[PDB]
């Protein structure tokens, strides 16, 4: 992996140079960026934490589904609606 | 031969050469090429209007996409004007 | 004019005063505007006339001293406000968005978030209804609302 | 220019009773007058 | 049905194109289209919009002649309006009479 | 000293009326571009001067953005067309003058 | 003109690069003449299928002027189509973000609403300041005249103009001013 | 302040000022007399 | 001394358009005479070529030149191959001069000669009426007769 770091002009270091872990010191604060653990295609309960439907009390094949996705006046679903997908 | 032009009927190669020979044999100075008008130039679709001058007097002007083809078209215009076969010339009397 | 200085010692002196140009074209007029035949022939651009009728610090002189009638005085006042907002008086200052024909003070108008239907449209005012009566020189009158 | 033409008496339409609309369109090349137009 | 009604639309659109091109050429000469048209009609020159656009494209010097003529007629009309009396009618504001 | 239009861009329009006043005569010789208004025309030791043939093949995206930037057009002109339209096109169009 | 057919066509349908200045101009007057020149409606050879638009280069778009209180009243609305995407920014805020946005939007609204519009937009070139790239500067022909007339601030008046304008009124000789 | 369509001066010390495009009744001695134009 | 009516230079004191003074009529008339004489000598010498004319014909205006074709949309009671004189000449022009009628040029000044060379029919034009839900459908097919003329000559004579 190559990553691009934004620096000012006084922090220029020659290309081809080695960097080690003592570039950082104890007792400080850092930000760590990484690609998270992929979960595949997940539904709304695991992806978004939706409450879902109860198990018993007459329920037909609906325990883990999104309910209404929008209102009836709009004949569409709003962009950014939380749906199953890649997590 | 009604609706055709001179260099569609009679193909020539060096209109600048023919023009300088005609001007030399009728005793006027050699024509100078100058860039009269110019649009674009750094684009892929320029326009160059190149004029041919003799003793600081305009004898021709011609358009083109490059300076060289504009100069060639101006030479053709000058040849048509000298030879009398111009587009607004008198039509044939039938 | 008259000046006062402080140095405690305060005193005022009378300095040189400009005079009216000798032969007005309409000597029977009442206001200076009516006298010099400018009744509907000036705008906010005419900073020569407005500078004749303002104070050294951008404010305005009153009617009993300018000799102006009330319509003309209110028209000069609006022209002077519009000229100040257009920046046409750089030296008559107190104590970047470019403008002209500015009726209201720029910090007092709220943005028109909801324009109306085109029978009830909220228009933006331009110019001055007091300068509505100026000479048109055109077959279309002044548009006071845009 | 209809109101101007009316002020000059020259109809309002240029295709009304002028020489432009009533003179013959053509004639024979030797000079014989054409048969009259149907309009 | 579209063919039959498009005959009317064809005539209307061609007049619109002629007015557009006359507007363009007149504005190149500094005039406006109402100025050109009205003052040509006042000069008794009865060229229509079709041949006026055709002259705008293929005979620019003839169109500049027409534009200068219309501009001069406009100036004569303005001068007559300011004069308001019985000053002479103007060279190009004379009207040929037919009986 | 009066001119209805400036006489320095196309032709020198001079208007006239005949003595009977029935015809208008326009005299308009062209205006020639002056010399002073023009501008002059702009102007390995051991091996052969080898001709520099490089043609970097570009993908559809970079090629279309290069063409569109060069001609000041959008990408939609450069995207292809299908066989229906390709066979609908008239390849022997009528030609006048 | 006794040209050949291909050079005659090239001369007739060649593109021109017009130059337009900002600096105290109303965006809509700039936009009206820019839309005319971008469509090609200034040519008598105009047709909507003739593709006869030209290039318009507007500079000093940071120094435009709005008449009235349009800087504080006129609102530009957009909607990022997410629930809550509705943004309404004043002309002042839009100008302080993007100094070409106001002129660009005025020209965009005045161009015809067809599939040629974004082509004309890509032949439109806008620059906020006096700086123009060198290729464009070698491309330009005909700086078009400015629609507004620059009302000439008081300190710019010559002393000849100042003393030629008559003094209208006599001030009293005892007033403080 | 209280919103009024008709602004009335309830004292001799009330004064009318047009600020930020609206009329206001201000009273430095009786602050309950403060009025804002609608 | 300011004249009575003197308004000082403000923005609205004077009209925005520049002041225009027209030429004095007698000098202008002599100028018209000299311009017409110059154009007449140009016609006499023959310093022209390739005239065009705007000609009124069959309710329409045609901008014709020599060796031209025009398609008139009605029958013209003339046999094919027949020379006629077009007469209602609104304009005749050339390079360096044009002549304009008010509204028509005199026939002693310009002569347009054309020739009927074809008498034919137009391609079939479909006239269809249809109104929906009211059973309104009619079809008609017409062919308009037509005449193709060739403009032979445009001749001007010294008469100005
Ligand atoms: Mg549960
Ligand atoms: Mg069941
Ligand atoms: Mg179950
Ligand atoms: Zn007064
Ligand atoms: Zn109170």
UniProtKB/Swiss-Prot annotation, chain A:
Note the superkingdom of the native organism. Eukaryota
Q: Where in the cell is it found?
A: Mitochondrion
**Pathology noted in the entry:** Combined oxidative phosphorylation deficiency 9: A mitochondrial disease characterized by failure to thrive, poor feeding, hypertrophic cardiomyopathy, hepatomegaly, and psychomotor retardation. Death in infancy has been observed in some cases.
In the record, the note on similarity to other proteins reads: Belongs to the universal ribosomal protein uL3 family.
Q: How does it assemble?
A: Component of the mitochondrial large ribosomal subunit (mt-LSU). Mature mammalian 55S mitochondrial ribosomes consist of a small (28S) and a large (39S) subunit. The 28S small subunit contains a 12S ribosomal RNA (12S mt-rRNA) and 30 different proteins. The 39S large subunit contains a 16S rRNA (16S mt-rRNA), a copy of mitochondrial valine transfer RNA (mt-tRNA(Val)), which plays an integral structural role, and 52 different proteins.
Q: What is this protein called?
A: Large ribosomal subunit protein uL3m
Instruction: Tell me the organism.
Output: Homo sapiens (Human)
Gene name linked to the record: MRPL3
The range of the complete sequence contained here reads 175 to 261 of 348
Curated annotation (Swiss-Prot), chain E:
Taking the first listed entry, what is the main subcellular location of this protein, grouped into a coarse class? mitochondrion
Gene Ontology cellular component?
A: mitochondrial inner membrane; mitochondrial large ribosomal subunit; mitochondrial ribosome; mitochondrion
Print the keywords alphabetically. Answer: Mitochondrion, Ribonucleoprotein, Ribosomal protein, Transit peptide
Where does it localize? Answer: Mitochondrion
Query: From the Swiss-Prot or TrEMBL record, what is one GO molecular function term?
Result: rRNA binding
Q: Name one GO biological process term.
A: mitochondrial translation
Q: Which domain of life is it from?
A: Eukaryota
Give the family, as the similarity comment puts it: Belongs to the bacterial ribosomal protein bL20 family.
Provide the assembly information: Component of the mitochondrial large ribosomal subunit (mt-LSU). Mature mammalian 55S mitochondrial ribosomes consist of a small (28S) and a large (39S) subunit. The 28S small subunit contains a 12S ribosomal RNA (12S mt-rRNA) and 30 different proteins. The 39S large subunit contains a 16S rRNA (16S mt-rRNA), a copy of mitochondrial valine transfer RNA (mt-tRNA(Val)), which plays an integral structural role, and 52 different proteins. Interacts with OXA1L.
What's the protein name?
A: Large ribosomal subunit protein bL20m
From Swiss-Prot, chain G:
A GO BP entry: negative regulation of translation
Localization (cell) = Mitochondrion
Taken from the record, one Pfam family name reads Ribosomal_L13
Q: What Gene3D superfamilies does its record include? A: Ribosomal protein L13
CDD domains on file:
Ribosomal_L13
What Gene Ontology molecular function terms does this protein carry? Answer: mRNA binding; RNA binding; structural constituent of ribosome
Name where it mostly resides: mitochondrion
Gene Ontology CC, one term = mitochondrial inner membrane
Provide the positions where the record notes the PTM N-acetylserine: 1
SUPFAM superfamilies (alphabetical): Ribosomal protein L13 (SSF52161)
Q: What family is it from?
A: Belongs to the universal ribosomal protein uL13 family.
Subunit description: Component of the mitochondrial large ribosomal subunit (mt-LSU). Mature mammalian 55S mitochondrial ribosomes consist of a small (28S) and a large (39S) subunit. The 28S small subunit contains a 12S ribosomal RNA (12S mt-rRNA) and 30 different proteins. The 39S large subunit contains a 16S rRNA (16S mt-rRNA), a copy of mitochondrial valine transfer RNA (mt-tRNA(Val)), which plays an integral structural role, and 52 different proteins. Interacts with OXA1L.
Q: Could you identify this protein by its name?
A: Large ribosomal subunit protein uL13m
Q: Which gene encodes it?
A: MRPL13
Swiss-Prot record, chain H:
The UniProt entry's sequence similarity note says: Belongs to the bacterial ribosomal protein bL36 family.
UniProt protein name: Large ribosomal subunit protein bL36m
Q: Which organism is it from?
A: Homo sapiens
Q: How does it assemble?
A: Component of the mitochondrial large ribosomal subunit (mt-LSU). Mature mammalian 55S mitochondrial ribosomes consist of a small (28S) and a large (39S) subunit. The 28S small subunit contains a 12S ribosomal RNA (12S mt-rRNA) and 30 different proteins. The 39S large subunit contains a 16S rRNA (16S mt-rRNA), a copy of mitochondrial valine transfer RNA (mt-tRNA(Val)), which plays an integral structural role, and 52 different proteins. bL36m has a zinc binding site.
Q: Which domain of life is it from?
A: Eukaryota
Task: From the Swiss-Prot or TrEMBL record, state where the protein is found.
Answer: Mitochondrion
């Amino acid at each position: 992996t190559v990553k691009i770091f934004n620096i000012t002009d006084n922090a220029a270091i020659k290309p081809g140079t080695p960097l080690y872990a003592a570039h950082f010191r104890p007792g400080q604060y850092v930000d760590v960026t990484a690609k998270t653990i992929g979960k595949g295609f997940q539904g709304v309960m695991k992806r978004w934490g939706f409450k879902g439907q109860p198990a018993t009390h007459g329920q037909t094949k609906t325990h883990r589904r999104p309910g209404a996705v929008a209102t009836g006046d709009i004949g569409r679903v709003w962009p950014g609606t939380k749906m199953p997908g890649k997590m | 031969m009604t609706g055709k032009e001179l260099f569609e009927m009679w193909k020539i190669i060096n209109p600048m050469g023919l023009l300088v020979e005609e001007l030399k044999k009728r005793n006027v100075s050699a024509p100078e090429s100058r860039l009269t008008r110019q649009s674009g130039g750094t684009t892929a679709l320029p326009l160059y209007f190149v004029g041919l001058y003799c003793d600081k007097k305009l004898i021709a002007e011609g358009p083109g996409e490059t300076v060289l083809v504009a100069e060639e078209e101006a030479a053709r215009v000058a040849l048509r004007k000298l030879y009398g076969f111009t587009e607004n010339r008198r039509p044939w009397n039938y | 004019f008259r000046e006062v200085v402080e140095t405690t010692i305060i005193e005022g002196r009378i300095t040189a005063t400009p005079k009216e140009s000798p032969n007005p074209p309409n000597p029977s007029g009442q206001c200076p505007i009516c006298r010099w035949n400018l009744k509907h022939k000036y705008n906010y651009d005419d900073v020569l006339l407005l500078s004749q009728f303002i104070r050294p610090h951008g404010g305005m002189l009153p009617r009993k001293i300018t000799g102006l009638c009330q319509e003309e005085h209110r028209k000069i006042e609006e022209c002077v406000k519009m000229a100040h907002r257009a920046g046409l008086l750089p030296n008559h200052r107190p104590r970047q968005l470019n403008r002209y024909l500015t009726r209201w003070a720029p910090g007092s108008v709220k943005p028109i978030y909801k324009k109306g239907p085109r029978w009830n449209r909220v228009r933006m005012p331009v110019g001055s209804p007091l300068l509505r009566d100026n000479v048109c020189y055109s077959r279309t009158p002044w548009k006071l609302y845009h | 220019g209809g109101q101007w033409r009316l002020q000059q008496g020259l109809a309002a339409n240029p295709s009304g009773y002028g020489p432009l609309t009533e003179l013959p369109d053509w004639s024979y090349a030797d000079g014989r007058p054409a048969p009259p137009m149907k309009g | 049905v579209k063919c039959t009604k498009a005959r009317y639309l064809k005539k209307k659109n061609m007049r619109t194109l002629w007015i557009n091109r006359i507007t363009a050429a007149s504005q190149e000469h500094g005039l406006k289209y109402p100025a050109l048209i009205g003052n040509l009609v006042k000069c008794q020159v009865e060229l229509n919009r079709k041949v006026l656009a055709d002259l705008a494209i293929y005979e620019p010097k003839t169109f500049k002649s027409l534009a200068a003529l219309a501009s001069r007629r406009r100036h004569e009309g303005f001068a007559a309006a300011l004069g308001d009396g019985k000053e002479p009618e103007g060279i190009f504001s004379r009207v040929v009479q037919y009986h | 000293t009066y001119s209805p239009l400036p006489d320095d861009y196309n032709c020198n329009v001079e208007l006239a009326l005949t003595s009977d006043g029935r015809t208008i005569v326009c005299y308009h010789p062209s205006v020639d571009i002056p010399y002073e208004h023009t501008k002059p025309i702009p102007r390995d030791q051991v091996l052969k001067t080898r001709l520099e043939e490089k043609v970097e093949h570009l993908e559809e995206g970079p090629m279309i953005e290069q063409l569109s930037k060069m001609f000041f057009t959008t990408k939609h002109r450069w995207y292809p067309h299908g066989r229906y339209h390709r066979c609908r096109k008239n390849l022997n169009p009528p030609k006048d003058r | 003109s006794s040209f050949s057919r291909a050079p005659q066509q090239w001369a007739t349908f060649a593109r021109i690069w017009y130059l337009l200045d900002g600096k105290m101009q109303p965006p809509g007057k700039l936009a009206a003449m820019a839309s005319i020149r971008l469509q090609g409606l200034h040519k008598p050879v105009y047709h909507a299928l003739s593709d006869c638009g030209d290039h318009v280069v507007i500079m000093n778009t940071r120094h435009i002027a709005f008449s009235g209180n349009k800087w504080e009243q006129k609102v530009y609305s957009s909607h990022t189509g997410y629930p809550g995407g509705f943004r309404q920014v004043t002309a002042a805020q839009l100008h302080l973000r993007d100094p070409v946005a106001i002129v660009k939007l005025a020209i965009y609204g005045m161009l015809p609403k067809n599939l040629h519009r974004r082509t004309m937009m890509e032949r439109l070139h806008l620059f906020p300041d006096e700086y123009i790239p060198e290729d464009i500067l070698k491309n330009l022909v005909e700086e078009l005249p400015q629609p507004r007339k620059i009302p000439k601030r008081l300190d710019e008046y010559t002393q000849e103009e100042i003393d030629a304008f008559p003094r209208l009124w006599t001030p009293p000789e005892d007033y403080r001013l | 302040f209280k919103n009024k369509t008709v602004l009335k001066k309830r004292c001799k010390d009330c004064y009318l000022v047009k600020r930020r495009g609206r009329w206001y009744v201000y009273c430095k001695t009786h602050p309950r007399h403060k009025q804002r134009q609608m | 001394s300011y004249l009575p009516g003197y308004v000082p230079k403000t923005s609205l004191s004077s009209p925005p358009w520049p002041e225009v003074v027209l030429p004095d009529p007698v000098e202008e008339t002599r100028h018209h005479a000299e311009v017409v004489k110059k154009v007449n000598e140009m016609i006499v010498t023959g310093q022209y070529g390739r005239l065009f004319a705007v000609v009124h014909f069959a309710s329409r205006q045609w901008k014709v030149t020599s060796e031209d074709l025009i398609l008139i949309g009605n029958e013209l009671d003339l046999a094919c191959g027949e020379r006629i004189r077009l007469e209602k000449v609104l304009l005749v022009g050339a390079d360096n001069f044009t002549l304009l009628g008010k509204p028509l040029l005199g026939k002693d000044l310009v002569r347009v000669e054309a020739t009927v060379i074809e008498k034919t029919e137009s391609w079939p034009r479909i006239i269809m009426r249809f109104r929906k839900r009211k059973n309104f459908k009619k079809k008609r097919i017409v062919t308009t007769p037509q005449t193709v003329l060739r403009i032979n000559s445009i001749e001007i004579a010294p008469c100005l």
